[PDB]
């Protein structure tokens, strides 16, 4: 309850509290699975940790639910893991998990994520249709005729 709902009100945090759980969120990262002290972190509004925590380790399902936590849940919006732990993205850096991320969140921010990994025209031709199959995002030019 320390840093939490600074998230909700907007138009904070004790490293004591913050660092205590930096045994814990890793205690959850040593488990690599799954969900608990992330929520503790979503509270934390620290733009170090969320870049800093998992740059490595986990994948599949695993970082897929790290994502919705990264931008949305903290008092601010965040990216870095989705550039950062995103980096290694072994099984296609990042193709495998990020497209599981590119779906859902009826968004587009994960459009590069596929771009970055998807390198084949024809893997992208499927991504092209995949970006196309969201037409509203893909239909207007400036995405269309540029991405389109």
């Amino acid at each position: 309850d320390q840093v939490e709902k600074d998230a909700e009100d907007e138009t904070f945090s004790k490293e004591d509290t913050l660092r205590l759980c930096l045994d814990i969120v890793p205690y959850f990262l040593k488990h690599n699975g799954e969900e608990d002290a992330v929520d503790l972190l979503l509270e934390i509004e620290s733009i170090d940790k969320l870049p800093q925590f998992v740059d490595e380790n986990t994948f599949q399902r695993v970082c897929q639910y790290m994502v919705a936590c990264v931008p949305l849940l903290p008092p601010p919006e965040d990216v870095a893991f989705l550039k950062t732990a995103y980096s290694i993205y072994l099984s296609q850096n990042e193709l495998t998990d990020a497209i599981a991320l590119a779906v859902r969140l009826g968004e587009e921010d994960m459009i590069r994520s596929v771009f970055d990994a998807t390198s084949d025209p024809v893997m992208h031709k499927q991504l092209a249709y995949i970006l196309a199959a969201q037409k509203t995002s893909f239909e207007y030019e400036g995405v269309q005729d540029i991405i389109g």
Binding site: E34, E35, V38, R61, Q64, Y65, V67, A68, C69, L73, R104, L105
Partner: protein, 381 residues
């Protein structure tokens, strides 16, 4: 987990909307009168029975009016007949809302039929069958006569009267049973939209006595009710045919059940309107009393023509399947001997899996050749 729970989060709120919603117009409309009207309306109707403490009907209890009670009980409580002299009541004899004779008739009408029947018809009749042209493929020669036996007299009864005659009053079908056989009956049944009674002799012999007799009557009863109706029997062999198994002595009623069927169908039944049709494996089993004219007149096989009939029949069938238009059904039909307008689907219908095994849209010649082989070999019967 988390992101999925967002979907799960959306799940909860979404459902709460209707919950919130449903309460809304709920406030608006405020359901007695759909019934409480009709209820109290028909409560009169209820009470319209309830005076004097009172289409099969079975029993009318229209009860205890003594001056008067105007009802039949066919039942072990207070059996009743209104008659003995001129005994009626202006619209309705009396009460129960039930007004009438039960089933068992006492005088006439009286209150228009309260009647008729218990056990519905335990036999059941599909009118205008799902078959009109359905198995009619390749079946012509038969139907050619059937139409005469059935269709035309249903169509233009006058001609036979214009001639001075009727249609064949009863007709036989044999070969592989019901195969298109019954459906073919069902065909012209629905071709002519006459009432098609499918009654299997299996229905006829049951745990008790007068069994089909009871039925055959109710049959013959609602025959005339359903007039211009096809009484159709698959399994004339169910009740059996001619036999001496009365020499054993237990079969007698089963034998009689035929004789029942035999007796009543003979004298009074219009068979130009009420059609009677029989389906068997063995025409050899007939009780000749069946084969009697004015009972059975026309006699027909199902049947199994030639190379040619099959082709069309094949051609007929395969149109369901995606089929190779190069290969000839004539080619296939050449190979197979004569066989059933059912079996000829084994020609086509089996090849679908061939077509799926061969993963074709359109089964090849061999696909059917194999099927021809496969099926016919697979018979060994």
């Amino acid at each position: 987990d988390d992101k999925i729970v967002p979907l799960t989060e959306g799940d909860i709120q979404v459902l709460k909307s209707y919950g919130a919603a449903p309460y809304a117009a709920k406030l608006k409309q405020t359901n007695d009168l759909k019934d409480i009207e009709a209820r109290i309306k028909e409560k009169a109707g209820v009470k319209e029975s309830d005076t004097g403490l009172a289409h099969p009907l079975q029993v009318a209890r229209c009860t205890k009016i003594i001056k008067a009670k105007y009802v039949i009980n066919l039942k072990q409580i207070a059996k009743f007949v209104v008659g003995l002299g001129e005994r009626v009541s202006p619209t309705d004899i009396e009460e129960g809302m039930r007004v009438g004779v039960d089933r068992s008739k006492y005088n006439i009408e009286l209150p228009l039929p309260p009647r008729i029947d218990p056990s519905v018809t335990m036999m059941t009749v599909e009118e205008k069958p799902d078959v009109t042209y359905s198995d009619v493929g390749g079946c012509k020669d038969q139907i050619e006569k059937l139409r005469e036996v059935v269709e035309l007299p249903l169509l233009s009864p006058e001609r036979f009267a214009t001639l001075g005659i009727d249609p064949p009053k009863g007709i036989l079908l044999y070969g592989p049973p019901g195969t298109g056989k019954t459906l073919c009956a069902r065909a012209v049944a629905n071709r002519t939209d006459a009432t098609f009674i499918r009654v299997i002799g299996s229905e006829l012999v049951q745990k008790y006595v007068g069994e089909g007799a009871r039925m055959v009557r109710e049959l013959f009863e609602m025959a005339r009710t359903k007039k211009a109706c096809i009484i159709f029997f698959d399994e004339i062999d169910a009740v059996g045919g001619a036999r001496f198994d009365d020499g054993a002595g237990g079969d007698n009623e089963v034998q009689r059940t035929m004789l029942e069927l035999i007796t009543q169908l003979d004298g009074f039944d219009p068979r130009g309107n009420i059609k009677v049709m029989f389906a068997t494996n063995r025409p050899n089993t007939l009780d000749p009393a069946l084969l009697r004219p004015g009972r059975i007149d026309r006699k027909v096989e199902f049947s199994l023509p030639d190379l040619e009939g099959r082709a069309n029949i094949f051609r007929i069938h395969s149109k369901s399947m995606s089929v190779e238009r190069g290969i000839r059904w004539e080619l296939i039909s050449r190979l197979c001997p004569n066989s059933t307008g059912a079996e000829l689907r084994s020609v086509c219908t089996e090849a679908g899996m061939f077509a799926i095994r061969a993963r074709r849209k359109v089964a090849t010649e061999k696909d059917f050749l194999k099927a021809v082989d496969k099926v016919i070999s697979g018979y060994k019967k």
